[PDB]
Structures are given as structure tokens and as C-alpha cells.
Amino acid sequence: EVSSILEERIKGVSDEANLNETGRVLAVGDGIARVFGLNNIQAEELVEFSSGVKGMALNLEPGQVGIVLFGSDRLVKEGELVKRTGNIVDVPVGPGLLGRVVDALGNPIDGKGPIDAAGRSRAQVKAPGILPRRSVHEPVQTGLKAVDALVPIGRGQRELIIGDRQTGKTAVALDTILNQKRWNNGSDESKKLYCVYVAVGQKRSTVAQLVQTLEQHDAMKYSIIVAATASEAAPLQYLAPFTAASIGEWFRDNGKHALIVYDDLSKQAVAYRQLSLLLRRPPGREAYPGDVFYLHSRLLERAAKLSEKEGSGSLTALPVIETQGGDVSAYIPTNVISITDGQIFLEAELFYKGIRPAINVGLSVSRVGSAAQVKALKQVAGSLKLFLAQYREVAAFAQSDLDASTKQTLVRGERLTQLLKQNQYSPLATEEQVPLIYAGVNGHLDGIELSRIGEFESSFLSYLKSNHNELLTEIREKGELSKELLASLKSATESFVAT
């Protein structure tokens, strides 16, 4: 029965004679087999054993060439063949990895769907030129109101999501993938970000929620999840961000966009540490290797927004960095912070205070930021930065009673803050982000009790869809507010505030 399928496969396996260069293990310890032979061999080239273990050649030296083993130490012994495949580590790239959860090696581990491939591209390549570049001005909507206005998001624009442990890091990121479903549904394929979530040194249990949540919202037909798990060895974890970016390059080169969310570079560093220390590489800061910087830098400079020549496409990025209670002065955070343009910094306090996401947007800046921002959102939330900004500093004054001025600022800030408290895993369109913020700015939301804010939000939205869904569609597709829409938009808020 089953035996027949296996019978089919068995026949498709034959005796294979010819094999190239080879080496024999002299001593194997700690995943570091040390091989005699392999004189002429490319730098970091792939080797295949006689027990079917794979390896890479970080160390080339004439006495011995020090292979690093990817699999088991129990199938590797003394005196064993090490065939030289003759191909530097490269992994398949195609369009077929859409809706596919793959291991670090590119094969389906969920057991759903084949890999339709067209090329294999190296895990490490070199970042394009100066001439293969164009300024960042393309928006991207994450569905959170705060992120899109205060510290906008762009295309080939990378900026951190650096925050504390289990404070809903993944929720900041997940909302964006789910929002990229919007462009995907249509047919202009220069607006389609084909998202990649890269779980590095992050266990299969955690990821099983990650896949499950995607599946429920029908989002495994463009999301790609490259996984090198906690159990899976240090080469696979070291090579997990390099494998994932490369899949994105096929899309990017063909003229498209795609988006990579790395989780997390705190765990990428840990794997390089394991490798360095067993190969006795130079020490550095905090007992992590000194040369970690070079690793991160190579990966983050390929994430870029290319010229129109290269098809008018980019690789957008969002690294997620895990902090030990908010330390950013820590050697691994510090490297990434300088390289990337922008940060988002989540805060433990906000979390405890029941505001989830606990994103704190005062200590968020984007270096490039609003050059990529929707026109509509810039008008109704320039004001919005200046209102929330004052309220923080004036919230260092605490209650008895205060000046007539000071108390006013808290009232305005607080209604806006409850507005920007949103439930997680709930995206928003451009047509429903823009009306709400205008209500805050123009003080038709900051005239209404705190408790009733949550209520106001849906009612106002429904009220706009029933009366005039024409104004919403107009807003969305123009991308901007005109004096005729701005006249109207005030009129509408008034009738709604009346009821």
C-alpha cells in the first residue's frame, strides 16, 4: 500500500559510482570535523558526507581544512569520506515559495505544495551599486495609525522594531503582513510585497501559532516562512536571514517588491557566537565575537530601493531585535541601530498599563521617515505629533489640581492615546485611518469622554459608510485631501458628534 509508494521511490535510487575530491576525518568533536584533504576547494563551499551530513569550509588551511558540520555527530566518525560537491552554498529562489513554510534549506517542512524553482542564488551575494538606487517615497500602511503618521514606513526602508521580551513584538510585525493582503488581492504587481517572516533560533512551537494565525486570515498564499529553529543547529541559524533575503531577490529583480521581517537578530548573534567560540575566533564585547558587525552589515545593505532600470522594485525590511529589559547600549543592539535608518521602541510600562501594542512613539524616530508617507495622513497628523509631544512632558505633572493650561493638555492627549489603543491583529484601510485622526486634531474627539472613545470610533466609521462612501473612496484613491474634501470632512464630523 504505502510500500508501493516507497517501491516507486526505491527504483529511483541507483548505484552512483563517480565522485570527485574527498577527505577523511581525522578527529570530530563538537560539530567540528577536521578533514584531511580538500586542497583545492572554494571558500565556504558545500561538502556532502558518505553518511549524508552537510558542511561548509570556514577554515581553509593546508594541514587540515576544518569543516563545520551542520547535522549529527553520531553519524560521523573517524576515517569517513567527505565528497566535494563543488557548489558554494546556494538555495533555490522562485515564485513558488509563496504559501510555503520551508526549513533553512528550502524544502517543505509543513508538507504542503512543491517548490517551483527557476534558479538557485547564493545565500551571500554583494549589495548593488549607487546607480541601482532611487529615493524612498513609496508608502506602506501597517494598519496601526501611530506608526503610519508619526514615524512612517517606506519601500526599501528599514527601521527597527526593537523592544522588550514577549511585549507583542510579533504583533507589531504581524499586522503589516496581514495588511499587505490588500494589494495582493488586486492585480498591480509592482505594489505587491510578498512577505517573508524569518524565525531564527525561534522554536517550532511559537512558529506553529505564527502559521496558524496566518492560515485563519488566509495569508499563506504569499507569506513565506523560512525557519531555523531553536533545536536546529548553528549553521542553519547563522544562514537563516541570508537564505530568506535571497528568495526576496527574485521578486525584486523581476521588478517587484517584497518584505522581510527578521526575527530576531538578537538570536542571529547568539548562533555566530557558538560558531566563533568552537573555531576559537577572536573575543569581543560581552563575550560575543568582535566581527559580528560585519555579519549584520552585509545582510542589511541589500535591503534597498532600486532604480527603475532594475524594474522599480526594492527589498523592504523590518528587523526585530530582542532587548533584555530595554537595554539598547548592548553590543548587539548598538551595531544594528547605527546600520538601520529609524527605530521603533516598545516599552514595558505601556504593556502593564494595559495598552497593547505597547509601542512608545516618543522614543521612536525614523531618519528617512515621512518622505514615504501618504499626503492625506501628513495633513491630518502633523498636528497630531505636536499634540501628543506636549502631553508627555505635561504628564510629568501629576494630581492635586494644577494650572488651567496644564490640565487641558492632558485631556486632549489622553483621548488621542485611547484612540491609538487598538486591538491587535486588526488592520485598517487608508479610508478609515484618515477620518479618525482628523476628529482628534480638530477636537471633536477630545470634547467627548475617554470611556466613550472606543464607542465613537466604530459609530463614526459606519456613519461615514452609510451617508457617503463616495468621500472615503475619493480620499483613498486620490491619496490626498483637497479643500472640497476638507470642507466636507468637518461637516460630517459635526453631524456625527451631534448624535
Binding site: V2, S3, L6, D15, A17, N18
Partner: protein, 50 residues
């Protein structure tokens, strides 16, 4: 229900050990001579072509 599910796997595992059982017969029989030699000559044909 659990063991029934387990059993379809076991059935294949019984065929795995069976490979070992024919292996014993090969090294006892003059398959130990004849098939080693089937193996040898193919290596001669491949290596002459290099």
C-alpha cells in the same frame, strides 16, 4: 485508535529490518562474490571514461 495509527508505521519498519535479513543471506551466499564483482566492473567502465 492510537495503536492502529502507529501500526501502519510499524508495518513499514518491519520491512526496514527485512533489508537487514536479506543482507545476511547476501554475505553468506556466493552473492558475496558475484555482486561484488557486478559492482567492480561498472567501476572499471566509469573510470575508463575519465
Amino acid at each position: 485508535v492510537r495503536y492502529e495509527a502507529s501500526l501502519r508505521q510499524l508495518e513499514q519498519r518491519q520491512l526496514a529490518k527485512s533489508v537487514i535479513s536479506r543482507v545476511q543471506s547476501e554475505l553468506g551466499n556466493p552473492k558475496f562474490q558475484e555482486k561484488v564483482l557486478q559492482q567492480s566492473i561498472s567501476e572499471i567502465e566509469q573510470l575508463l571514461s575519465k
